[PDB]
Each structure stands twice: as structure tokens, then as C-alpha cells.
Amino acid sequence: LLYPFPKDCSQAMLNGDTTSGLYTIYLNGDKAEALEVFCDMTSDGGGWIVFLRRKNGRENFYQNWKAYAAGFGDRREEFWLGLDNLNKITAQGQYELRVDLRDHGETAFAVYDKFSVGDAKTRYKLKVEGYSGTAGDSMAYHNGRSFSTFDKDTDSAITNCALSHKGAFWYRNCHRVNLMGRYGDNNHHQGVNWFHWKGHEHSIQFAEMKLRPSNFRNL
Ligand SMILES: [Ca+2]
């Protein structure tokens, strides 16, 4: 195989794996760092590690710092991959972000050709740049922010965004993207929001965040 120990879903796809599902990747190509991820092998060329999925409200996303650091949920259904995992993956090279949104027969997307998450000491600082798509550029507002949970507030408000909105995100004061919000909650700022597509009073039915090497698009 080209990559006996594929470090992301694009290497898995380059080995010949073409169907979406659970795959074992190996951080830094290291056999000892196995991580089971869901690969989206069909959207926009495939090769995508999914790290957030919302689709039915069964999982609770009002979780604490340790839980967002470690990941939670069923990776075949609603889940969060974990911030430690995201940092280790984005530290393996130059990665891009894709967000897929679906709601009552409508769809939209956003791609950011530069995406990285810092380590725990940086409180998982977000870098997200180079927008294209149809959802509207709602992540720009969050670029440069650290992550916040109700028990570790790093946002730019004197209040606690995560506590107030009962979610977690790279909050500022507070958000334009809230994809770890309260499922089906159309109250202002509470739901699964992508502001520049459907605003702050509409919770989106289906959302995925996913990443892959940015140069994979050029292959
Ligand atoms: Ca605060």
C-alpha cells in the first residue's frame, strides 16, 4: 500500500478505499497512535475526516472541557472527535476545512483552505482562513479564538458564552457559527446556527465539519 499507516482519510482514499465509513488512521503515520475516524469519501472529492456531526439531537453537546478535549459520541452518528485529536491531525500538515449543511431539502457548504487547531496550552486556538462556498463566511468571525466550555471560559465577553448558550465553541462574543448548539432550538443564538445562511433564530437539521490536506484538492 502507498500508506500502510494512513494518517488521514485522504491517504486512506489514495490506498483505494472509496466508501464512506469508519477507518483506522494513524497520527503521524505512527502505528502506535491509531485513531478510528469516520471518512466522508464522497463529498467534494472525498478523503475527509469528519470531526462533528449533527443530525437528530440524540447526543448532548453541552459538555465540559475534558469531554471536548477527548471527544464524545458515536462516530457513526452524532459525535465530536475531540480537540486533542484535531490538534494532532492539523499538526501533521496543511489542512483545509469543509462544512456541509442540510435543512429541509436545502443544502449549503463552506470551505476554508487554511484550518488548524492549536494544542491544549493554546486552549486549542483556531485558525480558519481562505473562504469559499454558499453558506456565507461565518467562521471568519471566530478566526483566532480559543475554545470555550461552560467550565473553562476563554471568550471575549464578560459573560460566559458557553454557559449562557449551553453549548461550546471557539466563542468570541459570542458567535456566528454554533454547530455544537442545542438541537432543534430556534431561540436566539441557542441552536445549531450558521448565521450567514439561516441566522440566529433557526437551528439547522444536519451539519458536518470535516478536514483533509489542502493540497489534496490539487491532485
Ligand atoms: Ca467570558
Numbering used by the authors: 1976 to 2194
Tell me what the authors wrote about this structure, in their words.
Using sequence alignments, we identified two amino acid substitutions that could account for the lack of interaction between RPTPζ and TNN or TNX. First, Y2140 in TNC (Y1294 in TNR), whose side chain hydroxyl group makes a hydrogen bond to the main chain carbonyl group of Q369 in RPTPζ, is conserved in TNX but replaced by a histidine in TNN. Second, S2164 in TNC (S1318 in TNR) is conserved in TNN but replaced by a histidine in TNX. The effect of the Y2140H and S2164H mutations in the interactions between TNC and RPTPζ were thus analyzed in an Alpha-based competition binding assay. Introducing changes to histidine at positions Y2140 or S2164 prevented competition, suggesting that each mutation is enough to eliminate interaction with RPTPζ. Not surprisingly, a variant of TNC that includes both the Y2140H and S2164H mutations could not inhibit binding between RPTPζ and WT TNC. Finally, the crystal structure of this variant is identical to that of WT TNC, indicating that mutations at positions Y2140 or S2164 did not introduce any gross structural alteration that would account for the lack of interaction. Overall, these results validate our structural analyses of the interactions between RPTPζ, TNR, and TNC and explain why RPTPζ does not associate with additional tenascin family members.
